[PDB]
Amino acid sequence: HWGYGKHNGPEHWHKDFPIAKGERQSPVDIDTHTAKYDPSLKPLSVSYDQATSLRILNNGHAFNVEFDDSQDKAVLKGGPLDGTYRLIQFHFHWGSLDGQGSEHTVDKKKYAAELHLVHWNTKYGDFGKAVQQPDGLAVLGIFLKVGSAKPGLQKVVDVLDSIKTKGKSADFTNFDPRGLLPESLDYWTYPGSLTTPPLLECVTWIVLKEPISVSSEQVLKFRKLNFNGEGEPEELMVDNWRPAQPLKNRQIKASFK
Numbered sequence: 001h002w003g004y005g006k007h008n009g010p011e012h013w014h015k016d017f018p019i020a021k022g023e024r025q026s027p028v029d030i031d032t033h034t035a036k037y038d039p040s041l042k043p044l045s046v047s048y049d050q051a052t053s054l055r056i057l058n059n060g061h062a063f064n065v066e067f068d069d070s071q072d073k074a075v076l077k078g079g080p081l082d083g084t085y086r087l088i089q090f091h092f093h094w095g096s097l098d099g100q101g102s103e104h105t106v107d108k109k110k111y112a113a114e115l116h117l118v119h120w121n122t123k124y125g126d127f128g129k130a131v132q133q134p135d136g137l138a139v140l141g142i143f144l145k146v147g148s149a150k151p152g153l154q155k156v157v158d159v160l161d162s163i164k165t166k167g168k169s170a171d172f173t174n175f176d177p178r179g180l181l182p183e184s185l186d187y188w189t190y191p192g193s194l195t196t197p198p199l200l201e202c203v204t205w206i207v208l209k210e211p212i213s214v215s216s217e218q219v220l221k222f223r224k225l226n227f228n229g230e231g232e233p234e235e236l237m238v239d240n241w242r243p244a245q246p247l248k249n250r251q252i253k254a255s256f257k
């Protein structure tokens with residue numbers, strides 16, 4: 001199956017998923033000088049106060065924290081969006097070194113990791129239906145740089161022991177995602193896709209200008225996960241990121257000057 005290795009990495013995905021070569025694929029490099037400042041952009045509205053996390057699991061590609069998206073508990077609104085988007089899960093993409101890991105790049109600069117808070121448009125009924133629409137999902141991209149520790153990430157870090165191998169999951173209730181947000185909500189936005197197969201072009205990418213910083217040992221724990229299941233030969237989960245795709249006939253709007 002697809003993965004991030006030489007024989008099943010991103011440069012092979014198109015063979016099983018032709019959309020890999022589509023017109024609005026992510027991630028892309030964000031050129032700060034050619035991004036158009038759009039004054040008609042509203043501020044983002046991130047309502048994560050009623051967020052209910054439930055479980056965290058290693059799905060072979062990364063660890064995911066899932067939330068109870070049965071009701072509008074943690075929604076994203078405003079910004080370039082029209083409609084309410086419910087939070088369903090969040091994951092990370094990191095590297096084997098501190099100078100790579102982010103999918104999106106700013107002026108060709110890569111960050112240690114990138115957090116993705118995934119939401120689906122509520123006018124579509126369920127996630128399954130949202131993925132069949134050009135405006136079905138909204139993903140909040142947040143870069144992570146190495147520096148001081150982010151206290152809000154530590155709770156996630158401690159539990160990685162329990163989900164070391166593919167398929168393992170653990171209960172992860174009462175987690176407040178608000179602790180992983182930067183001070184500023186200034187963003188860049190553009191229409192794109194999922195960065196992993198099936199590579200569907202249903203996403204409105206909202207990438208924040210301000211990155212959060214985590215410690216060296218915090219991201220270190222990330223690199224100790226396993227792509228493989230228990231028993232199989234160990235394959236360290238690192239560099240689970242896709243390289244930037246051509247921007248093509250698209251424009252990146254900035255919510256700031």
Ligand SMILES: CN[C@@H]1CN(c2cccc(OC)c2)S(=O)(=O)c2sc(S(N)(=O)=O)cc21
Nearest residue numbers: 061089116118131139193194195196197198
């Ligand atoms: C592996 N695909 C990931 C999980 N998803 C998924 C799960 C079930 C079905 C499906 O499509 C039919 C997609 S997902 O939509 O939550 C996302 S979003 C995303 S990223 N890096 O672009 O943010 C990676 C994945």
Ligand SMILES: [Hg+2]
Nearest residue numbers: 132133201202
């Ligand atoms: Hg779509």
Ligand SMILES: [Zn+2]
Nearest residue numbers: 091093116195
């Ligand atoms: Zn992602």
